[PDB]
Design a protein around this ligand. Sequence first.
Ligand SMILES: Nc1ncnc2c1ncn2[C@@H]1O[C@H](COP(=O)(O)OP(=O)(O)OP(=O)(O)O)[C@@H](O)[C@H]1O
Ligand SMILES: [Mg+2]
Lengths: 247, 221
Amino acid sequence: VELREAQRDYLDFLDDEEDQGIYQSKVRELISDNQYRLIVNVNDLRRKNEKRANRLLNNAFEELVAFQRALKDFVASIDATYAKQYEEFYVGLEGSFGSKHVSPRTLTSCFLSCVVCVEGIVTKCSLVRPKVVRSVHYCPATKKTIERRYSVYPTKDEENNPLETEYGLSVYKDHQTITIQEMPEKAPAGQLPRSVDVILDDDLVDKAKPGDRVQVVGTYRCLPGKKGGYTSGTFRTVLIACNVKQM
Amino acid sequence: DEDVKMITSLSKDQQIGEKIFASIAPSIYGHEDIKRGLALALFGGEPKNPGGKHKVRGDINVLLCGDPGTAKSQFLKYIEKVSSRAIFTTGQGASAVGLTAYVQRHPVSREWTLEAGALVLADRGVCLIDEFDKMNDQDRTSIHEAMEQQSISISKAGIVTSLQARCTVIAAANPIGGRYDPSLTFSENVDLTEPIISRFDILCVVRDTVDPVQDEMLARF
Ligand SMILES: Nc1ncnc2c1ncn2[C@@H]1O[C@H](COP(=O)(O)OP(=O)(O)OP(=O)(O)O)[C@@H](O)[C@H]1O
Ligand SMILES: [Mg+2]
């Protein structure tokens, strides 16, 4: 019920053409420019719906999923032809967050599952790597094709017949990891710096380079303890970015 | 308890000062003035601080400069033996105790430690320096700041500290040319700078003039 109401509110937010809105023109430009990411100002959403903005800031994952679903529905309604190419769209955020504008030094557990904005410098970057989404396999012995989705790699048929992988039919997405360090111009003198880890996916992979000053908006989450009968009770925290800006 | 009474009785002696002066360095022949100055340094004075603005120290630093073969190191060894808290070091190098503070993993204990210089370890004690003219820039700067400000400031590996270094410094040195020249001043005969020399309260000059009777007595001893 809550998710459906949030989706309804998000759908109502976008239909602003009869209210001097700009987002319809933005979506038209995105379709024209073959882009699948939309940037929405947090200030405008707060002006139009403060409760939805508060819920999104205090709870990110579910609200972001609902907003992506709403954007999918909106793009479908505009031109379902374009929506066929991509499975889902992605959301970008902009504006003044206020209390959630947090430097790497001031990041704490109080901001878990929330949307935060950080400003820093890039020190470490990793090579771009593909990640599997779907897999297609073929059996020359029986001329049968099987499909698998990911969110175990099959190797043999039911009758132990060998399976051959079709790399071209599979789906891959880009992935990269970067590190952000507090700017020395603002860090206290005589103290060691503190760093945060950020994950970039899809079209945001190649938007950062080491030695550059950037501003990143994204969700703050923990990583669960890996498999084992005993756990230390300490989880690593990694930022999942949704928008990167060159200041 | 009886020791206090014995000390008070000894103080009533009319020649207690001469006895104390002659007691220092029994194995060293001659150099009465050096022994007297070392006694004065050992007994020390009294620091003063009107309010929290004007600080005046009470430590008596001693510098000895002399020709080779005048037994300068024996006085330092005797002072190290006598003093309850005495730290001995040499400026040549490979000293057991360093003169500059640093943060490092100890080779033996394998633990992350902050090791201060000999000046800090000698707080309210005595610091003896041999080969005072062989020191490098870091040791000279550390000694200068420990003698002027009586404190050491450390800013290393994210650690910012200030440590007290209230100590009495006794140093030994040799002339630039290997032999003291009376025609030149003391400053021109030593590789040290004037501000460093100005810190020492007592400066002693030792020469190796050929006196047959003194040489005969020294050889007999
Ligand atoms: N007045 C003295 N009485 C007894 N021994 C003496 C006297 N003067 C010098 N010596 C002897 O001279 C020797 C020289 O060694 P010593 O370490 O004392 O020299 P030093 O003056 O420190 O020399 P250097 O300039 O090379 O550092 C010693 O074995 C010491 O016993
Ligand atoms: Mg010597």
